[PDB]
Write a protein that binds this ligand. Structure first.
Ligand SMILES: O=C(Nc1ccccc1)Nc1ccccc1
Ligand SMILES: O=C(Nc1ccccc1)Nc1ccccc1
Lengths: 346, 346
């Protein structure tokens, strides 16, 4: 089940499974921030049980995969290259690729640049946003420069969490003081029950400024950790044991690699300009969450899905769940994936 | 036995042991590059058995301890601060501190700056080199600037491995292509049997240029890995299981943190100028290895040991062993430590 791949110089660790005959359409699962192959624990057995060869990797910088320090190692095309390397290790011509959160842009771009290797693509939480990487209330497909739109048009004397993440200084310092607690905080805050709670504190007007006054919109000089909300008890879907696993992965891997993903957003935006316009042709699908910030911020990109993906197979919304979609609604997510993959030809 | 310390914002993981009454002089073991608390596996039980509270940590950037990205987190005083934090967690006023390789300058500097917290200090492989951090054939106590002496006076069109390590680009890339193999290579090359082998290839003249034409002296553009020597079989002291452990630690931690230690050598040299001259007063001891590059390069600093450490208790040389001293000669190392600590007052 545990595999160590390294087709072209980069070590990629993974957890695989499939029918005993080890035959069936290859399905690659790409996790987001700050997660791991473990975020797909509820999907792996279902996918393998339906007859698919499922491969859940640790992206570079995460878990047991190669940890690079230089910023250029975390640019979008490199991430996409790793996926290509995964298929070449299994000797697969085509593959179904599913990505959640940061894994999404990587899955989307993989489909964008390598349609000949993609039997279909599914993005979760973060909808296809072209050179933009992640669609926002103002820029669904990276119309304006990422960092620019952040600074101006997001807060007077405040700071966009992504720019903070990119600095890789204060952010890591705040995490290291108490990493287990930080994960718990972040996880709960953007989770369904966490978001519905914050809302329950009522006391509807312009989404563009809803991001502001939001948990991820901090005041220059403060700590993101300062806006976290902690549960009195561990949610039913995210148990103590799960938290110990993630904590274990990150106090060993650190957040340097993961955060570098963010550091390159602008760079990615630039690297993908030569693709702007061209459509994404493999069969595509998007799974969103009612209270997921990703789904929300990407509303406009979603509305214009069919415009850029001529073979879009639909937008699916999972009610009463937040950001950690495949973890917050594993069975519903499984049904959706299984339906998508089942109606397709490997 | 496994402990998670965090007295002041930095997570430090460790493996501890002691008599059941959990009482006795505190002994802190500091590992080097690229090692872990595991490098002291043969010492922990002996020290605990003799009645000492032994604590073997993972320095920052290693194993399960906090992984910082910024360069300033890996400067000498920060490393030393972590040690201080270790004693405060056990509430110990004084402690015996043993350091091998990179752990040595940290143990030495700890004694240098905090004599009031040090019952005694032991450096292994790397002898006390003042603001120099690591003594060299030319500069035993950091007489000339570290990087300067490297460039000029070390190779025409060649490059000093430490400067390469500091760049943190090519070095990591070469490692990631095959990390398990890299560790095996590095470990064997500078090991006793590896060094005696290279020498057996005879075919004595100026040590200053012996470093050159050496394995750690590479030609600009080449890979350090290019000069490695691999054993036909695993040495008796460094087994497959040990290698799997180290491999496991590093493909999770990466080398970014460890390498940053090197990146700050010059900076350290600068940070410790305000200490130049002042003597190191706690009871000190040095353990060297006949074929250890550390012991060899630090020959001059060794000859002048009593000059800077008025309470030096002696230089000890372990024959027929290379760089990995406490691993290559665990029992001999244990006897030496036990003798040193036994004749002292906690
Ligand atoms: O910001 C997040 N993701 C992201 C993915 C691709 C491009 C840019 C950003 N995730 C996130 C997840 C949980 C809490 C906060 C943010
Ligand atoms: O270079 C090494 N150590 C060191 C420690 C303190 C300051 C500067 C350098 N170790 C080393 C160990 C094995 C192989 C090669 C180098």
């Amino acid at each position: 089940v545990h595999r160590i791949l390294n087709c072209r110089g980069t070590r990629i660790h993974a957890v695989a499974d499939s029918p005993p005959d080890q035959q069936g359409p290859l399905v690659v699962l790409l996790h987001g921030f700050p997660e791991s192959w473990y975020s797909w624990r509820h999907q792996i057995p279902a996918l393998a049980g339906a007859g698919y060869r499922v491969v859940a990797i640790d992206q570079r910088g995460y878990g047991r995969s190669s940890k690079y320090r230089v910023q250029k190692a975390y640019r979008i095309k490199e991430l996409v290259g790793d996926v290509v390397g995964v298929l070449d290790s299994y000797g697969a011509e085509q593959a179904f690729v599913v990505g959640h959160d940061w894994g999404a842009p990587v899955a989307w771009t993989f489909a964008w640049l390598h349609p000949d290797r993609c039997a279909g693509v599914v993005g979760i939480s973060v909808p296809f946003a072209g050179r933009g990487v992640i669609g926002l209330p103002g820029s669904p497909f990276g119309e304006r420069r990422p960092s620019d739109y952040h600074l101006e048009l997001a807060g007077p004397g405040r700071v966009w969490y992504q720019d903070y993440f990119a600095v890789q200084d204060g952010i890591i310092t705040e995490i290291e003081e108490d990493l287990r607690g930080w994960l718990l905080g972040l996880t709960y805050t953007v989770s369904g029950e966490g978001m519905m709670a914050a809302t329950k504190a009522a006391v509807s007007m312009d989404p563009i400024d809803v991001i502001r006054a939001g948990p991820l919109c901090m005041a220059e000089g403060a700590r993101l950790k300062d806006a976290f909300v902690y549960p009195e008890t561990m949610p039913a879907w995210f148990t103590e044991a799960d938290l110990d696993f993630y904590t274990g992965e990150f106090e060993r891997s650190g957040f340097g690699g993961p955060l570098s993903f963010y550091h390159n957003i602008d760079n990615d935006w630039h690297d993908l300009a030569d693709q702007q316009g061209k459509p994404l042709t493999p069969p595509a699908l998007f799974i969103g969450g009612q209270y997921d910030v990703g789904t929300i911020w990407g509303a406009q990109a979603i509305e214009r899905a069919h415009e850029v993906m001529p073979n879009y197979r639909g937008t699916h919304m999972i009610a009463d769940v937040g950001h950690w979609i495949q973890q917050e609604a594993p069975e519903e997510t499984n049904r959706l994936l299984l339906d998508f993959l089942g109606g397709l030809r490997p």
